[PDB]
Design a protein around this motif. Structure first.
Motif, PDB file in Angstrom:
ATOM      1  N   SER C  39      -2.464  -0.892   8.369  1.00 16.66           N
ATOM      2  CA  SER C  39      -1.679  -0.502   7.205  1.00 16.66           C
ATOM      3  C   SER C  39      -2.398  -0.819   5.904  1.00 16.66           C
ATOM      4  CB  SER C  39      -0.323  -1.196   7.228  1.00 16.66           C
ATOM      5  OG  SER C  39      -0.482  -2.599   7.323  1.00 16.66           O
ATOM      6  N   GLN C  40      -3.267  -1.831   5.903  1.00 19.77           N
ATOM      7  CA  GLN C  40      -4.055  -2.116   4.708  1.00 19.77           C
ATOM      8  C   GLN C  40      -5.027  -0.984   4.400  1.00 19.77           C
ATOM      9  OE1 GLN C  40      -4.038  -5.103   6.942  1.00 19.77           O
ATOM     10  NE2 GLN C  40      -5.953  -4.902   8.094  1.00 19.77           N
ATOM     11  N   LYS C  43      -2.914   1.724   2.848  1.00 17.70           N
ATOM     12  CA  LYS C  43      -2.460   1.191   1.566  1.00 17.70           C
ATOM     13  C   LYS C  43      -3.549   1.301   0.506  1.00 17.70           C
ATOM     14  CE  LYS C  43       0.334  -2.589   2.493  1.00 17.70           C
ATOM     15  NZ  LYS C  43       0.769  -4.000   2.304  1.00 17.70           N
ATOM     16  N   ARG C  44      -4.764   0.855   0.831  1.00 17.50           N
ATOM     17  CA  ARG C  44      -5.848   0.922  -0.142  1.00 17.50           C
ATOM     18  C   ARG C  44      -6.357   2.343  -0.336  1.00 17.50           C
ATOM     19  NH1 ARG C  44     -10.335  -1.869  -2.827  1.00 17.50           N
ATOM     20  NH2 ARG C  44     -11.483  -0.844  -1.133  1.00 17.50           N
ATOM     21  N   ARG C  47      -4.096   3.543  -2.826  1.00 23.98           N
ATOM     22  CA  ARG C  47      -4.437   2.928  -4.107  1.00 23.98           C
ATOM     23  C   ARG C  47      -5.698   3.543  -4.704  1.00 23.98           C
ATOM     24  NH1 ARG C  47      -3.569  -2.662  -4.119  1.00 23.98           N
ATOM     25  NH2 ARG C  47      -5.094  -2.678  -5.825  1.00 23.98           N
ATOM     26  N   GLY C  58      -4.621  -2.597 -11.549  1.00 23.11           N
ATOM     27  CA  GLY C  58      -4.690  -3.881 -10.881  1.00 23.11           C
ATOM     28  C   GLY C  58      -6.103  -4.228 -10.460  1.00 23.11           C
ATOM     29  N   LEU C 171       6.287  -1.470  -1.527  1.00 22.34           N
ATOM     30  CA  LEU C 171       5.719  -0.531  -0.570  1.00 22.34           C
ATOM     31  C   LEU C 171       5.532  -1.226   0.770  1.00 22.34           C
ATOM     32  CD1 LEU C 171       4.337   2.112   0.328  1.00 22.34           C
ATOM     33  CD2 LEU C 171       2.240   1.281  -0.747  1.00 22.34           C
ATOM     34  N   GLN C 172       6.089  -0.635   1.824  1.00 22.01           N
ATOM     35  CA  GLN C 172       5.945  -1.136   3.185  1.00 22.01           C
ATOM     36  C   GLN C 172       5.254  -0.067   4.019  1.00 22.01           C
ATOM     37  OE1 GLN C 172       9.552  -3.007   4.859  1.00 22.01           O
ATOM     38  NE2 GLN C 172       8.705  -4.794   3.801  1.00 22.01           N
ATOM     39  N   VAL C 173       4.124  -0.425   4.622  1.00 24.74           N
ATOM     40  CA  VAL C 173       3.318   0.496   5.416  1.00 24.74           C
ATOM     41  C   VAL C 173       3.171  -0.083   6.816  1.00 24.74           C
ATOM     42  CG1 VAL C 173       1.168   1.797   5.553  1.00 24.74           C
ATOM     43  CG2 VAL C 173       2.084   1.165   3.330  1.00 24.74           C
ATOM     44  N   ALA C 174       3.354   0.760   7.826  1.00 24.33           N
ATOM     45  CA  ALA C 174       3.132   0.379   9.211  1.00 24.33           C
ATOM     46  C   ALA C 174       1.740   0.805   9.661  1.00 24.33           C
ATOM     47  CB  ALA C 174       4.193   0.998  10.124  1.00 24.33           C
ATOM     48  N   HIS C 175       1.313   0.240  10.785  1.00 24.01           N
ATOM     49  CA  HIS C 175       0.041   0.612  11.382  1.00 24.01           C
ATOM     50  C   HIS C 175       0.192   1.933  12.124  1.00 24.01           C
ATOM     51  CE1 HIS C 175      -2.393  -3.347  11.240  1.00 24.01           C
ATOM     52  NE2 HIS C 175      -1.473  -3.362  10.292  1.00 24.01           N
ATOM     53  N   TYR C 218       3.736   5.606   8.703  1.00 27.62           N
ATOM     54  CA  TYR C 218       4.995   5.215   8.090  1.00 27.62           C
ATOM     55  C   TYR C 218       4.714   4.692   6.689  1.00 27.62           C
ATOM     56  CZ  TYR C 218       9.785   3.111   8.172  1.00 27.62           C
ATOM     57  OH  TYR C 218      11.095   2.781   7.928  1.00 27.62           O
ATOM     58  N   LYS C 250      -2.549  13.804   0.974  1.00 28.77           N
ATOM     59  CA  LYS C 250      -3.826  14.460   0.731  1.00 28.77           C
ATOM     60  C   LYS C 250      -5.048  13.561   0.892  1.00 28.77           C
ATOM     61  CE  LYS C 250      -3.622  18.238  -1.956  1.00 28.77           C
ATOM     62  NZ  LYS C 250      -5.083  18.116  -1.706  1.00 28.77           N
TER      63      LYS C 250
END
Lengths: 165, 368, 375, 370
Positions: C39-40, C43-44, C47, C58, C171-175, C218, C250
């Motif tokens: 998920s990281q 997430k990144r 970002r 940030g 923000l919550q992200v699953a693997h 997710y 995208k």
DNA sequence: AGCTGGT
DNA sequence: ACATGTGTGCTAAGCGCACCTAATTTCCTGACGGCAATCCTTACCAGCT
């Protein structure tokens, strides 16, 4: 034992196409492809009528798949917890040694069928360290009796003994 | 009369609970390693769930004087409050104290600010703390209170702080051999540098498992500690049923958003509870057909069969329930046609269990 | 109002995330081996995407002093910024502060204005620096991701105080788990021994692993918390939701993409709004077996439709509505044909989808929420 | 600005990317076994191509001593003081295939490494003449990786950041259908009758035949940053890549399996974000008696392209592209027409259309850059 | 008038 | 888990491969929270039974 040696020697006789179709069957049972079962039957049937002791069928199938994938050579005295541990001394004890060490201890709490991928990663780092010899007979008869804890503790103590030396 | 609530939850790769070193919790059940979720984590997540907010009325704080000082615009009482608390029996800012929130707020504010005494002020503060039982979260989780005998006064007493827990949450035992997985993460340094490396190379461990979750309500205890009323008891039972079916432990959910839902509910009314841990003493090894959820449900239904015939209790039969949504996952695939009221909803089973509790309805009770 | 995005993505042979030894990240979901993306990573990738530049702000860095020195220009300033930041409680050992620090970019200017001020002493300057750092919550990246600052205690000046430096994530992200049964493959690479010499053998050989998968991704976005820690800037919050949706659709994780150019767009997106987060990872407990009459992505979407209609029947007939905007490109693969009524709005265009979600949250226009940016 | 290539080929019975056993490479895509041509193999066949023998500016060698050779004898002067950089010798090698150019490197690395000037003082000159150049097209497309060892190298080497990102993203070629492996039994027969009628060596060969899908994506401003403002060499790079992806094939067991075939479909799109139309062939192409495999695969590709175009577009910025089939035997299916802006029947005109989109650079004077 | 729970 | 159901009638021998090959730098987290009691008395004294 005088039965598993013939199985390993017959496995070393296998030509490139046979172990290619064995390579393609990683993680797959010996049913969904006919040629794989035919090869396993040819390898596994005729060694029960000549010697009274044979390995377990699942152990033979898993060892054949791993042997096709990695293709080592049979040499006495080169079991897994000696070469393992010998490579653990060539490590930094701070960070990487617990990583590889946990990768090795994952094997000690698994059943025969699910060990294909942990044995794959263990033999992958063995291949990365350029290991040619592996005692396939020794591995096979410590794996066919893997469910009794004395041989697991003996294997672990062999790792300890190879690590302290 | 006591209520059993059983779940079988399969979860995405997640770390909902860790020990001091950060590993997911493990227990040696049946001679093999089983993944474990702590009962207290489940109890806390159901306490902080988004549907308990009408019933969340318990506070576990050591900063009681801070709570007093917050609700005082200009009357600074925080050293006097601190010394009142320090001779109450707590000795320091204190130890952990369980009570109702609004009750302690308003009436400890009125009983603390008046300049009428310092010793009897601590005594009546302690009595207000000890009488704070008008909260059902205290009634469910349970609370004792032990003050010191050294840093106190000989004229300050404590009443009997006996509150029994009306809930026995079991630890979520995995239905198979635990496969603890090692996650390797790095931390990116946003600004660049010469090294082109990570800000922090770290360790995280995650486990994907099908957890057998098990709770139990002592409804008789739930009303023997929540006084003579039953409206609040039925509301709390419905609130727990909704929360447990709806919320998840707030572990590393920001990194593993495993918000999967319980694929099984088994509610059985009797006076002798049972966990189906022995349904999975044999580890569940999947086959090519079906999935881990179905094999686990199959072993569970086999166990339900020989504890509904071999250990049959036909003096008080099972009112065994399901949450099989439009019968996606049936229980009796071969023989176990003993699911008397297999449904495919959640509010229906809530209403049904409060119906066998007594003459209640789901919407009318949801106002206390 | 909790916006959730469920994404079914089929990816080519790729290695988008790997462990220390180079194997792709694997998980044991349902008792069988499935390939996994962390998920990281997503997430990144959200970002550091090609639509989130207007929403950046940030730095979770360890080299604050370099940025303060760059603000200072050619006025030396490395040593005194170092000693001030070490006096706050972020110790340095080799050249950098020994912990990650997260803080808005616009506070660099006034942080350097504190640093360059020679009239202040030592504890006053460090306290002002800590006050500026701890009250830097102006960006949407810290809004979505989170923050923690816990300064070190032993080598800290006693006259230093910190406010609450922690923000809560929105923000919550699953693997991302593989829909099908996943097997890894084995590839050996070689080097170019192009100039002959005399061996004519091999220059370098090795071993690499990869996997192809259909992924279930997710994302979970809160509205009240995202606007609460963005101090009620609703234009900025709607811009974050819209640009986040466009980024999630995208963009792809940048793991070994130069050798595995897996840039496949989602073949089905489920965007829904309700109070509590649903999840569809249990839709694929049984791995998808590909039969000849169907497809992998088609069967994955069908199993997802079965589970979504299943828990919509068992979950979503209440007084609280649950409204979803199912997206496929131009209706490639619609929902389960046994139901044909599960989706509220069968969306075929991603931009009409972002217009529709921006209209639903409070009523917004992409051209009007683009006019507000934080950078 | 991203320039994307999507191709469809179909080869004869072939062994292009065989195993060390000999088995042609396979991968699973959509749960079915597909033949895979390795991305490294595609990139190397692109680099070594005949039409890439007008662009080359790097070698990426292993032992730079023999290349820095040809006073007239600098060795054992090359290999001996090569160990100071962290590249030790193991049977006269450097143990690291340095990513590194070929023209200015070899032309200005002799002056500082032909002895003299002191050891560890020519180490900074080694760093300057190894870790600086980057003005090579194929290197900037394929990136750059470099690393000096810490165990043997002295502390007088000041190695800067030599990490250079790659401007190219290629994907492994995937067959559009279910791959089948064929076991060609073969022997080696003796002709001299020195004994009884034996043969010699018997064994096996494994091969396959497939219709392949290949994807490429050439970044534009990243490439022009990597080459630092050389527009005409960048146009040379994009045009030569468009030509070399089509006209060139892998070089596996082509001696015994001659499967040189040309792509019958090339699709080039111009977006600021990347896509890959590989999800079209999640279903393998089942050949029917009324059509052919190539036409069916192209029809599925046109279906997916039109669908993604209508689903992930209608911005203020439209998606413009040119579609290529040779002499128009395979237009874009029988579905909605006019999907592509220009259906082009010739390869050079497709390259010219891409180049005219690029900003208005032609094809002839661009080659005058190098 | 003694007794028993507290100091 | 080859044998055994032959049913006019089902061959067969010679042959099965060698060698070069596996790289590294650096990066690794701070702080806060840690339970109270009760398991033999300076024993008589006064709330009141």
């Amino acid at each position: 034992n005088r039965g598993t040696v013939d199985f390993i020697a017959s496995l070393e006789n296998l030509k490139e196409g046979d172990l290619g179709i064995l390579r393609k069957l990683r993680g797959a049972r010996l049913d969904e492809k006919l040629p794989g079962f035919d090869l396993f039957s040819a390898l596994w049937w005729p060694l029960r009528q000549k010697n009274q002791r044979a390995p377990k069928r699942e152990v033979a199938w898993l060892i054949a798949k791993l042997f096709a994938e990695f293709r080592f050579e049979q040499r006495e005295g080169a079991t897994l917890p000696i070469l393992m541990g010998g490579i653990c001394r060539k490590l930094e004890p701070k960070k990487e040694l617990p990583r590889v060490l946990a990768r090795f201890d994952q094997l000690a709490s698994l059943d025969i069928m699910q060990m294909e991928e942990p044995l794959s990663v263990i033999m992958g780092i063995l291949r990365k360290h350029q290991q040619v010899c592996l005692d396939w007979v020794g591995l096979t008869d410590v794996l066919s009796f893997w469910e009794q804890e004395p041989v697991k503790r003996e294997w672990s103590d062999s790792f300890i003994k190879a690590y302290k030396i | 009369m006591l209520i059993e609530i059983h779940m079988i939850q399969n979860h995405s790769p997640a770390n909902l609970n860790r020990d001091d070193l950060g590993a997911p919790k493990t227990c040696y059940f049946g001679g093999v390693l089983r993944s474990r979720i702590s009962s207290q984590c489940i109890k806390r997540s159901i306490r902080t769930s988004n549907d308990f907010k009408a019933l969340l009325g318990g506070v576990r704080t050591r900063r009681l004087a801070d709570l007093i000082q917050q609700e005082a615009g200009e009357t600074e009482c925080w050293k006097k409050a601190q010394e009142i608390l320090n001779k109450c029996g707590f000795k320091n800012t204190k130890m952990l104290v369980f009570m109702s929130k609004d009750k302690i707020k308003d009436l400890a504010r009125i009983v603390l600010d008046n300049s009428l005494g310092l010793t009897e002020a601590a005594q009546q503060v302690a009595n207000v703390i000890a009488q704070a039982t008008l909260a059902p979260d205290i009634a469910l989780c349970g609370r004792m209170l032990e003050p010191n005998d050294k840093d106190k006064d000989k004229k300050v007493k404590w009443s009997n702080t006996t509150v029994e827990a009306a809930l026995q949450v079991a630890h979520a035992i995995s239905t198979h051999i635990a496969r603890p997985e090692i996650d390797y993460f790095v931390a990116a340094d946003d600004v660049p540098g010469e090294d082109a490396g990570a800000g922090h190379i770290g360790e995280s461990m995650f486990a994907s498992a099908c957890f057998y979750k098990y709770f139990s309500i002592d409804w008789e205890q739930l009303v023997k500690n929540l006084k003579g009323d039953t409206n609040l008891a039925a509301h709390t039972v419905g609130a727990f049923l909704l929360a447990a079916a709806k919320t998840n432990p707030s572990g590393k959910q920001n990194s593993f958003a495993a918000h999967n839902y319980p694929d099984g509910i088994l509610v059985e009314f009797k006076n002798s509870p049972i966990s189906y841990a022995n349904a999975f003493v044999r580890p569940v090894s999947v086959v090519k057909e079906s999935d881990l959820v179905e094999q686990s449900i199959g072993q569970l239904s086999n166990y339900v069969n020989d504890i509904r015939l071999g250990y049959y209790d036909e003096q008080s039969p099972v009112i065994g329930f399901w949450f099989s949504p439009n019968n996606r996952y049936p229980l009796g695939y071969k023989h176990s046609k003993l699911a008397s009221r297999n449904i495919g909803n959640l509010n229906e089973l809530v209403g049904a269990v409060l119906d066998y509790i007594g003459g209640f309805k789901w919407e009318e009770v949801q106002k206390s």
